[PDB]
Amino acid sequence: QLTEEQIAEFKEAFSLFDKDGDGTITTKELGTVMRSLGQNPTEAELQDMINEVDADGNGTIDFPEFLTMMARKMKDTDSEEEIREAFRVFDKDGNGYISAAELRHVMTNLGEKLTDEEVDEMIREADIDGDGQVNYEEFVQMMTA
């Protein structure tokens, strides 16, 4: 079941998207996050993304809506191409391994300000074989329902 700490984790994630902290994610903020990950969505695609999860139809995503759709999405596994694309966002040098520094780099680009300890903690949890890095196979497991 959903725990308190998991809720706080999702709340942290919501704050990543909610740049101005006004309690809602707009198409503008979603576009901002996507571009910082190197993706180039259109205005129409951003509207459609939000429409899919905007339960009250008001044009923006609040925390309950964010929590609802994210918890649902975690119960699904995305296609290999979708996962492989996400992996390349992190594996910048393309060597097949996500290092702490590469994770630091993405999180920084997202505007988040993590400590070296916090990043290592993330790597450690995703790491399976214990080499201190995340390969594609481990990345796939992490994203697997």
Binding site: E5, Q6, E9, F10, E12, A13, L16, V33, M34, L37, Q39, P41, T42, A44, E45, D48, M49, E52, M70, K73, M74, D78, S79, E82, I83, E85, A86, V89, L103, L110, E121, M122, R124, E125, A126, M142, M143
Partner: peptide, 23 residues
């Protein structure tokens, strides 16, 4: 740590892909 912050941004890719229209 359940990596839900990291997992949330990764979920964006498939979320976006599902709405794409070719130019």
């Amino acid at each position: 740590q359940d990596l839900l912050e990291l997992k949330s941004v990764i979920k964006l890719q498939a979320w976006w892909r599902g709405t794409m229209i070719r130019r």
